[PDB]
Ligand binder design. Structure first.
Ligand code: MG
Ligand code: MG
Ligand code: MG
Ligand code: MG
Ligand code: MG
Ligand code: MG
Lengths: 327, 333, 327, 333, 327, 333
């Protein structure tokens, strides 16, 4: 609700509160903290290795030993959680995506290593088949190349269970199959994984902003990911995921969809997350490196998510932002 | 909103996504050329064209060159331009008098375009930052503070000079309190009954303006200066509603949120609460970010229409965008 | 929500935005596009045949070969979908409406032909028994002449399945039996027709505006179709149809019910369709032909549906409108 | 709204539909004669009756004939008439002075009806289009634009002349900004304390007015002219709320949406947001469309009461309709 | 929603519309019609008999033959429905309330007689045990004198079925047992009484206004009927009854609860009824007979129900009101 | 509202009803003596007590008798009285001058009660109907119409005379447009800063006032007359919101709905929309109806507290009720 309350110039001058830092601080509506940050990480198969990514300047693919080294500092900075994205070797991709539930798959190995070394650090695993398929699509294809909904869910369920067994505190289904949150929740409950959180990618759009990620991980989408034009539809997606048992719901991409974040928080009043995707990172970082924009745009972009209603932000800027906030 | 007890598998939201025809039927928003406003940087002199390193693909244009390029903008159906003069260094002063010079770049450009393309909307910029030695949007007191009401007096003279030049829309971008009402009162008294006022209502103290300050040549003047005593704190959303309410009460015909994509939640709230003509500026930093990534091959050119569609979905009636020509071309196909 | 925001003349003059075409275009709230149009078509049994309809000037009943010819152009104009209405031969009408689920019935034959020749064109079939009954009522009658609800649903389910088997992407139950959307959805799901859309005629009124259609197809209603007086009741109809699995919901007739379209979109935020019925078409076309109204009323009438909240419009003017929009 | 977990088969919405008695009990809206206003076209002279080809069944009537026909309108219980003079060609001018002639058709007709039928509501039309050579609703400037405030001055004189003639309601149909407040101020100053103002608040730039322009004889004058600079864009709904809010603030006793059936969503929003006396005009084109189809045998005469019921359901308190006599007759039975 | 829209005297004078009858008629927000009236009738066991009721001046208990005579006129006046209340002979009252489901009970006999003679007249039977118990309470008592909820429902279900078998179009459970609407609906559906309406007495208050009725029929309540103090509680009652299948919901008593009628209509937008109870009738009629109030208060009281949001009114003034409306 | 998926048998609403203690815990509203205002009919002269046949148990009282009875009203904790003078026939006139007589019954009674019981609230009636020969609430023009603004002038003089007499609250019951603002302006100008105005905001043209008109002696004067040109149409609910909004804008400290029980929906809407101090009059006809039935043995005396509880539940902050003494007695026990 809102009421202008008959405020009128010059009795009301909105610049008065802007006059001094102390009053700007007092009326400041939102603040970003390190409690808000989730760091996505690209994880390699090998040992004592890192790789640079052409379209994601400054971001590295890390072997697990290197991931453990970097995590010490992420923990010291107070970053609450990581989101793991394995970089699957080619030999291990298949039509059936079986590597998704391999107990010795990269995601599973990385999860065990991190849970043991940093017990308080949140590990959010990715429940998705596209890192494991030869076609790079987010599911099992029928003979006509369509991603089969329910058949794909069966594999996602096995994958989610394997992550829970590896000790992940949160599994995050990013697949956009209908009904997958309920299927995964039912499976977790029956297997006794009472407290494993499900972070649903609820309103995930078919987007050009995912380009750099596809490079990072080494990977039509319009038949499952959402049309960028659609806002009301996002409410139905979130409503279903909450009914199906999600503990958190997410909007993807991020800044191009801040209106969706706002509507979702306003309507459901549930823990709401947003992904500042690879293309958003790359655009900002490229402009900063070129000297076109100041470093301050990073915190401005992240503050936007808070103002828009996000409880947490998956962002490749997490470390940089945490360092800035710590000072 | 009411979920209406929709549940999988009776409800599968992928069904409408299955085919292009059903995606088209349920598509909630569509960008058209009706939605686009093209900002243009205008140089003094004749036969001048200058590239802007921090805005790849954008040029500053002398009036003769502007008139030539506008032929294609008009052919593409772009409804309006927003003019930004590149003020010569020597014409900057403490008093910002060049703002209301009937022979200033903005005024000259307006008269030329109104004559040549009578149906094309011309939106002039009401602001003092192109004209001040310090790069601030108003007149400074002895403590270095941007004076509110004294600045309004100059903005009023500027707006009147634009109306006299034939501008159909004046757009105060200054963020002084109460300037919309002062400008409206002045336009009414002077008989400029139908000159629209496009208020920059919720304009934030942003870092995304860097490339624009280069383009217009205010960057050198501003130096490390900031605008936190007048432009809004990025953290604040409720405050934007109070800004818009005042500007509507004061007579604005349109209200604007600036920057754009980093403030889509503000666009949404403003449209939802006021149900008034709502505009959004996809600013220079947004343009530069996208361009840089496209030219690097990091993002497909399809991101341009995705970014612009977002504004429509968020509630904008129109978008000031440096991509206007490209977008119009892509929409025409 | 709304807030006048203390706007007052002469500070606020609403004519300023109206002063010039460019500003009218900038503030224009709604636009009709070809994405919004669905063309209903009356389909004959024979070959190389068309028939004119006295009460629907300009509209033709088409044999399937003629339908295929005209569809080439409808596709070229970008019309996304057709709604098929078979003109059932007399010999084939019965009390049990068995022709409804005949795999060689007109609707089924037309569907197969169109799906093969124009794979991207949406085909919306009509799930209804009134084209197939000897009494022309929308269901199976009991001994007292009442349309039996559940018994009629059993036939509608068989019909819907036959349309799915013929390849229809959308089935549209126009019958106004209670609970039929759920029964049809359950049947489609169990038979593996996962992606067949159901476009529910949710709030379909007992109306005098259907007269010309009844002539077109060669066909008391108050015991199932809605009382024109009732608005709140339409919300209950739509709520049930959404709970029962409808992918789209429709209001019928159209322009005499624009307030219903508005309420339905506002309350449910779901894909909402509206039928500009035969009587609406006939009124407009008659007035245009008589020289009483300009052709421009067509686009004005269709723009109304968009403004009122419709996502799509079933309209006999679809081709004319698409041609106007293309220029 | 709350669905309250209603589900088939426990909820079968056909149960209330099963019998006439239960349909009658749950029926949400009912049209009565309290709801009907009859527009009438008034000729100069004596013993004149003229048929209008594009409005079958409607006649232009001289005042003597009007008085005779009004006997039955009153007997049927129709609460009010809306008068539309058919101005002689020679009395049209640039200055629209005939609008405020105390001996103009509207004024004469008002005095005659107020004397003969003291309880019958008379709603006069405040607009300049019957009186201008160009057929526009106001006075034109040298650029062909309908001047806002100069036109208001004439409309004020017209409204005062109607009040002097005894009209209980004046209905400004002109769509000039601010005219409701100007007319109200003038009525108050002159002591016309109780003269109602029925604002045409959300009146659209429609194609459904064709037959009316024939009936009143403004068609020849307007030619191919349009009213897009004052009448509303059919695409716009939010804008209608701003129009109504201003007219209520300015003192309107009733507010109207025009045309009718193509704008039922606007009627609904206006009633919902303002909870004020809300009227709707079922315009000449709506009447003609229906009549044409009825006379062709394409639609049953029951469509008349269906069309009018729609207005009640949508939120209208009253309906200006050329079907008023027919409807009143059908309701009396 | 509401918005004052800055209306201010003297620009706004609300008396202008009040100045003349014609403008009062145009802006009049609500009208009572005969479509709104339901007439309760007290039915005797005998033949060729009527009885006067001391506390309900002008109201008569009628034998069935007399009821048929009076109904001819009620039908001629256009009253859509009657609500039957049998006056049970003493010999037939019992602890088990078995007379409630006797196929030859007064209510059942009256229903058959009326359905045969006036097929279009709505008959609403009373589903309640208090006309049949020796203690006059609304159910089966346990050993401590408490009205047992579920046990009482079992009897109410048998009663409702007996009314459906007698041909009643509407059964109206007036008992205020929890969950009885659902139990009755389930029973009607299973027995094939698809179209029998259930008019739930949803928010029925423990009231002093029922005194005269108790005399009419010849009959603690706070453990089932609602506390007069409670408004929010009425919303929960109605929500349950709608979920349980009620076709109409009712508020009882009437005029002392118009705020409840308003809230119920506003929140549920469902067919909403109100009972102007015996004490309301008696108060008004007594004052009229004493010459303290004019007859016009009858229509004023009934107009109140319409304005408050009622779709129909059970009122002992139905005939008088219908006569006034007819003139 | 949100049903929260409550379903039988997990939800049984009889559980809270099972025992007195849980009924008491969940009870949503409670009537107290804080809620009661007692209207009293005041006679001229000394030692006068008169019974009113159409209001059993109510007496008209001379000021000396009023002072005696008020001792018990005060002891019972009744916060305020509403005074209604029974004007002698000879003091009625066209000009209603007795309304502002400093020696009128209302004024005399106010001074006496303010002196004797300094803490007792005195609410005077601002209205001309006790003082006019015709029984209408204002001054009549030559057509028999109750003039709005001319009547306000007299009401203002009356209200000032009440403030001078010491009334803490003046209650304009007249239903003239704009009278609240006129009275407030006058009170402010005269220094009556803290005199409350209890507006009769939504007062209906009701038939439930009959016994009151007997009690005050206006019945003979009014005869068959009506008040439909100023009191509200019983059919209208939205209109009541506009009445209240104006009275709040005009400065009312409290707003009232009248009659009471037949208008509980209006009380509810008014409280819900304005969240202001909201009062309701349980009028003479409501009192008479209840009394008649109680004395006949048709209703138990418990109906009195049931009727009054309804007002609290519906949203009233206070109730003007002829049952105030009985209710206070029953609440004290
Ligand atoms: Mg989903
Ligand atoms: Mg501002
Ligand atoms: Mg249905
Ligand atoms: Mg206007
Ligand atoms: Mg209950
Ligand atoms: Mg008032």
């Amino acid at each position: 609700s809102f009421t202008p309350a008959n405020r009128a110039y010059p009795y009301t001058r909105l610049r008065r509160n802007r006059r001094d830092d102390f009053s700007r601080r007092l009326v400041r509506e939102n603040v970003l903290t390190v409690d808000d940050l989730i760091l996505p990480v690209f994880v390699l198969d090998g040992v004592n290795q890192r790789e640079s990514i052409p379209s994601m300047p400054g971001v590295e693919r890390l072997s697990i030993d290197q991931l453990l080294i970097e995590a010490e500092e992420w923990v010291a900075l107070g970053i609450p959680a990581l989101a793991l994205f394995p970089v699957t070797p080619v030999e291990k991709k298949s039509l059936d995506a079986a590597e998704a539930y391999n107990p010795e798959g990269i995601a599973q190995r990385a999860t065990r290593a991190l849970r043991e070394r940093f017990p308080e650090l949140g590990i959010i695993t990715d429940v998705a088949l596209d890192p494991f398929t030869t076609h790079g699509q987010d599911g099992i294809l029928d003979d006509d190349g369509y991603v089969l909904n329910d058949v794909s869910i069966d594999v996602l369920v096995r994958q989610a269970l394997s992550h829970a067994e590896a000790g992940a505190q949160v599994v995050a289904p990013s697949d956009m199959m209908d009904g997958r949150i309920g299927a995964i929740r039912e499976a977790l409950e029956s297997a006794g994984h009472t407290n494993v959180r499900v972070m649903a990618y609820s309103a995930k759009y078919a987007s050009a902003y995912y380009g750099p990620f596809r490079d990072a991980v080494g990977s039509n989408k319009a038949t499952y990911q959402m049309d960028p034009a659609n806002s009301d539809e996002a409410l139905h997606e979130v409503a279903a995921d909450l009914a199906e048992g999600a503990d958190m719901v997410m909007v993807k991409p991020g800044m191009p969809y801040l209106d969706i974040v706002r509507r979702v928080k306003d309507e459901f009043r549930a823990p709401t997350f947003v992904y500042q995707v690879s293309g958003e990172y790359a655009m900002h970082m490229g402009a900063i490196q070129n000297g076109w924009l100041a470093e301050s745009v990073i915190l401005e972009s992240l503050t936007a998510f808070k103002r828009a209603g996000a409880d947490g932000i998956l962002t490749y800027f997490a470390k940089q932002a945490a360092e800035q906030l710590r000072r």
